[PDB]
Design an enzyme around this catalytic site. Structure first.
Site, PDB file in Angstrom:
ATOM      1  N   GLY A 231      -9.010  -0.475 -41.888  1.00 48.69           N
ATOM      2  CA  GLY A 231      -7.845  -1.322 -41.791  1.00 48.69           C
ATOM      3  C   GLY A 231      -7.788  -2.233 -40.583  1.00 48.69           C
ATOM      4  O   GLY A 231      -6.850  -3.034 -40.485  1.00 48.69           O
TER       5      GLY A 231
ATOM      6  N   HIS B 198     -13.693 -11.072 -46.744  1.00 49.10           N
ATOM      7  CA  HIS B 198     -13.944  -9.912 -47.603  1.00 49.10           C
ATOM      8  C   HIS B 198     -12.659  -9.263 -48.117  1.00 49.10           C
ATOM      9  O   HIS B 198     -12.728  -8.359 -48.957  1.00 49.10           O
ATOM     10  CB  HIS B 198     -14.843  -8.856 -46.940  1.00 49.10           C
ATOM     11  CG  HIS B 198     -14.208  -8.043 -45.852  1.00 49.10           C
ATOM     12  ND1 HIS B 198     -14.619  -8.128 -44.535  1.00 49.10           N
ATOM     13  CD2 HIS B 198     -13.264  -7.067 -45.888  1.00 49.10           C
ATOM     14  CE1 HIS B 198     -13.918  -7.276 -43.799  1.00 49.10           C
ATOM     15  NE2 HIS B 198     -13.092  -6.619 -44.595  1.00 49.10           N
TER      16      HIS B 198
ATOM     17  N   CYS C 247      -9.990  -4.604 -39.683  1.00 46.88           N
ATOM     18  CA  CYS C 247     -10.575  -5.925 -39.847  1.00 46.88           C
ATOM     19  C   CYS C 247      -9.504  -6.981 -39.693  1.00 46.88           C
ATOM     20  O   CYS C 247      -8.341  -6.761 -39.997  1.00 46.88           O
ATOM     21  CB  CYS C 247     -11.272  -6.050 -41.189  1.00 46.88           C
ATOM     22  SG  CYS C 247     -12.728  -5.069 -41.287  1.00 46.88           S
TER      23      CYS C 247
HETATM   24  C1  LIG Z   1     -12.168  -3.533 -41.952  1.00 47.36           C
HETATM   25  N1  LIG Z   1     -11.010  -3.111 -42.198  1.00 47.36           N
HETATM   26  C2  LIG Z   1     -13.377  -2.584 -41.874  1.00 47.36           C
HETATM   27  C3  LIG Z   1     -13.627  -2.137 -40.443  1.00 47.36           C
HETATM   28  C4  LIG Z   1     -14.536  -0.913 -40.405  1.00 47.36           C
HETATM   29  C5  LIG Z   1     -14.097   0.321 -41.173  1.00 47.36           C
HETATM   30  C6  LIG Z   1     -14.565   1.452 -40.257  1.00 47.36           C
HETATM   31  N2  LIG Z   1     -14.718   0.881 -38.902  1.00 47.36           N
HETATM   32  C7  LIG Z   1     -14.709  -0.457 -38.962  1.00 47.36           C
HETATM   33  O1  LIG Z   1     -14.816  -1.184 -38.052  1.00 47.36           O
HETATM   34  N3  LIG Z   1     -14.576  -3.293 -42.382  1.00 47.36           N
HETATM   35  C8  LIG Z   1     -15.345  -2.732 -43.482  1.00 47.36           C
HETATM   36  O2  LIG Z   1     -15.040  -1.686 -43.947  1.00 47.36           O
HETATM   37  C9  LIG Z   1     -16.525  -3.514 -44.006  1.00 47.36           C
HETATM   38  C10 LIG Z   1     -16.047  -4.408 -45.140  1.00 47.36           C
HETATM   39  C11 LIG Z   1     -17.224  -4.842 -45.983  1.00 47.36           C
HETATM   40  C12 LIG Z   1     -17.432  -6.223 -46.371  1.00 47.36           C
HETATM   41  C13 LIG Z   1     -18.548  -6.521 -47.138  1.00 47.36           C
HETATM   42  C14 LIG Z   1     -19.450  -5.504 -47.517  1.00 47.36           C
HETATM   43  C15 LIG Z   1     -19.249  -4.157 -47.127  1.00 47.36           C
HETATM   44  C16 LIG Z   1     -18.096  -3.866 -46.360  1.00 47.36           C
HETATM   45  C17 LIG Z   1     -17.804  -2.410 -45.885  1.00 47.36           C
HETATM   46  N4  LIG Z   1     -17.547  -2.529 -44.447  1.00 47.36           N
HETATM   47  C18 LIG Z   1     -18.256  -1.753 -43.394  1.00 47.36           C
HETATM   48  O3  LIG Z   1     -17.939  -1.988 -42.268  1.00 47.36           O
HETATM   49  C19 LIG Z   1     -19.312  -0.714 -43.816  1.00 47.36           C
HETATM   50  N5  LIG Z   1     -20.488  -0.996 -43.021  1.00 47.36           N
HETATM   51  C20 LIG Z   1     -21.510  -1.869 -43.597  1.00 47.36           C
HETATM   52  O4  LIG Z   1     -21.392  -2.325 -44.690  1.00 47.36           O
HETATM   53  C21 LIG Z   1     -22.759  -2.176 -42.755  1.00 47.36           C
HETATM   54  F1  LIG Z   1     -23.019  -1.093 -42.005  1.00 47.36           F
HETATM   55  F2  LIG Z   1     -22.472  -3.204 -41.926  1.00 47.36           F
HETATM   56  F3  LIG Z   1     -23.797  -2.533 -43.582  1.00 47.36           F
HETATM   57  C22 LIG Z   1     -18.745   0.701 -43.687  1.00 47.36           C
HETATM   58  C23 LIG Z   1     -18.237   0.973 -42.254  1.00 47.36           C
HETATM   59  C24 LIG Z   1     -19.833   1.742 -44.064  1.00 47.36           C
HETATM   60  C25 LIG Z   1     -17.548   0.819 -44.731  1.00 47.36           C
END
Ligand SMILES: *C(=N)[C@H](C[C@@H]1CCNC1=O)NC(=O)[C@@H]1Cc2ccccc2CN1C(=O)[C@@H](NC(=O)C(F)(F)F)C(C)(C)C
Ligand SMILES: *C(=N)[C@H](C[C@@H]1CCNC1=O)NC(=O)[C@@H]1Cc2ccccc2CN1C(=O)[C@@H](NC(=O)C(F)(F)F)C(C)(C)C
Ligand code: NA
Ligand code: NA
Ligand code: NA
Ligand code: NA
Lengths: 306, 306
Positions: free
Chosen positions: A143, A41, A145
């Site tokens: 950040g 991603h 991930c």
């Molecule tokens: C990586 N850096 C980050 C880790 C997150 C941020 C807050 N705590 C964490 O562990 N990962 C994301 O932000 C992902 C990335 C992503 C990829 C594809 C589609 C959508 C996203 C947004 N991300 C989320 O983790 C979001 N949650 C969800 O989309 C769901 F709950 F799993 F459906 C969100 C935390 C709301 C940004």
């Protein structure tokens, strides 16, 4: 004496962590030999988050769209590919600190150490379990991930987790190092949620054995039980069923303490029915389920790593 | 989201750990530049444990009585001295992995990471606090002496603990890296015991703030209190007194959450008087006191280290 939530020493993994940037998105990668592993991603834009077509997004990129930094040093990307939900960036330089390592896909109930990282730099290390609902109760911020979970065995780092997403209950989901999610989660913005979770029974039993090893018997009783009758009570308190395989794995701890597994199950039954009555076990007022039988032996025996 | 007992990444300390042998006694040392630091009781024999005269025992030794092994490599001891309860072994080789480092003597209530080690090899890492009674609730077995506790700040490893003894309650005592014990403990076999301990109030408050930051407010109330009136309740529940200095240190967390410190004290008072009523805070059924205010900011803000 003592019993702590103990992580593996993190040094071998610290030396593999890098920073990966694509567009405006920066996160962590894992640098092993001449490949850098990271969540795919990173190539997404905030506009195409609901339903990204990753094959389509990636064909539009070139190697130079990816900036990889190890320390201060830039690593030049010379190749790229997608494997499930992880990107593999071939770089011009093999990591000189690459440890002996394996990729492993763990079962729920297994534990691992997480090296939380931001911008390629380690922040902290903690111990987690893969829950039965295939989430982990991590501690992760924007950040993070690309941070990885791992076990160590003698010389060998077994990587088992890479962090991708946080669910609405604030628990966490990600992939093995081959990019396959644990559980039914996906790397797109959708209504996904953690399923109902259960308590990891074989681990609670291991931790009752740790407590006995550490000189505490207050919760024991004289009774025994059958596996069948115990599982009837397990089910009632939202505990995972105990299998004969679990019983066999608990053999060494049963043997060291002289308490038959099914006798410890009788103690656990009484603890579930009666509570702890304001008493504690190994410093906890709850029944702990994020130590495996192997974790207990490791910390009550002092296994080291080379 | 999430909140974990998080240790510092251990790699910089792993590279300093060695094994020290004198006679039949083997334990761990810390190798920084060309000096190896270890507990002076390595020179003791099981016969002279009640009342050893260390100056007398050490004058009878030569450099070649000390075997120091880093990995497989022997390091030759070329000098030795005693500083309080630690021995300093000058060796022919400067550690090439010596990090930027400091020696610090911490105050009770401060936390640090412990790298548990056996025979010079790291076993695991966990987070501990220096208790008000100057013990630590560690996890340590035979052979663990010389394991060190530390904090990291950017580049700099601040060593603050070296492990020496286990007390009869199964808690642990040791020294700063200059060999001065924390608390009234000594490195001889005597009837010493942990004094009565108290709960680290400023830390419980920090952790209530972490819980709010992580989206949980159930334990808050509308009341406030005076420092004086709060301390009257503290004293009653065996909590450390809260000083104005503690209040000021909690400023940044009060500011980020909008909850005045004395308002959080009112919440804590009610929690002490009424209990938790089967509810949990950040996954705990007890009030946690081994996170400092700095620990909370670090893990709710994602500070990293270089
Ligand atoms: C990586 N850096 C980050 C880790 C997150 C941020 C807050 N705590 C964490 O562990 N990962 C994301 O932000 C992902 C990335 C992503 C990829 C594809 C589609 C959508 C996203 C947004 N991300 C989320 O983790 C979001 N949650 C969800 O989309 C769901 F709950 F799993 F459906 C969100 C935390 C709301 C940004
Ligand atoms: C170091 N390897 C070891 C660490 C201990 C062993 C079990 N868990 C631990 O943390 N340290 C010792 O065994 C010390 C060494 C020592 C020096 C001088 C005099 C006596 C000793 C014996 N040690 C103890 O820790 C013992 N406890 C005490 O002497 C007292 F409780 F502090 F008084 C004992 C654990 C009973 C061996
Ligand atoms: Na992007
Ligand atoms: Na029983
Ligand atoms: Na000796
Ligand atoms: Na209040």
């Amino acid at each position: 004496s003592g019993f702590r939530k103990m992580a593996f020493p993190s040094g071998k993994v610290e030396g593999c962590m890098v920073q990966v940037t694509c567009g405006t998105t920066t996160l962590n990668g894992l640098w092993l030999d001449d490949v850098v592993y990271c969540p795919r991603h990173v190539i997404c834009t905030s506009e195409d988050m609901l339903n990204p077509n990753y094959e389509d997004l990636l064909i539009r990129k070139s190697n130079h769209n990816f900036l990889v930094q190890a320390g201060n040093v830039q690593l030049r990307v010379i190749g790229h590919s997608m494997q499930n939900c992880v990107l593999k960036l071939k770089v011009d330089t093999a990591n000189p600190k690459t440890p002996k390592y394996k990729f492993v896909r763990i079962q729920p109930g297994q534990t691992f150490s997480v090296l939380a990282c931001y911008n390629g730099s380690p922040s902290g290390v903690y111990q987690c379990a893969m829950r039965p609902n295939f989430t982990i109760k991590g501690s992760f911020l924007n950040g993070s991930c690309g941070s990885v979970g791992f076990n160590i065995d003698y010389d060998c780092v077994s990587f088992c987790y890479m962090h991708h997403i946080e669910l609405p209950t604030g628990v966490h989901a990600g992939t093995d190092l081959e990019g396959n999610f644990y559980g039914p989660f996906v790397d797109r913005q959708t209504a996904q949620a953690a399923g109902t979770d259960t308590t990891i029974t074989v681990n609670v039993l291991a931790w009752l054995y740790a407590a006995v090893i550490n000189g505490d018997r207050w919760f024991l009783n004289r009774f025994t039980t059958t596996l069948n009758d115990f599982n009837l009570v397990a089910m009632k308190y939202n505990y995972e069923p105990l299998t004969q395989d679990h019983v066999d794995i608990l053999g060494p701890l049963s043997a060291q303490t002289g308490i038959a597994v099914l006798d410890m199950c009788a103690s656990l039954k009484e603890l579930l029915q009666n509570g702890m009555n304001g008493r504690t076990i190994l410093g906890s007022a709850l029944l702990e389920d994020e130590f495996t039988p192997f974790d207990v032996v490791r910390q009550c025996s002092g296994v080291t790593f080379q």
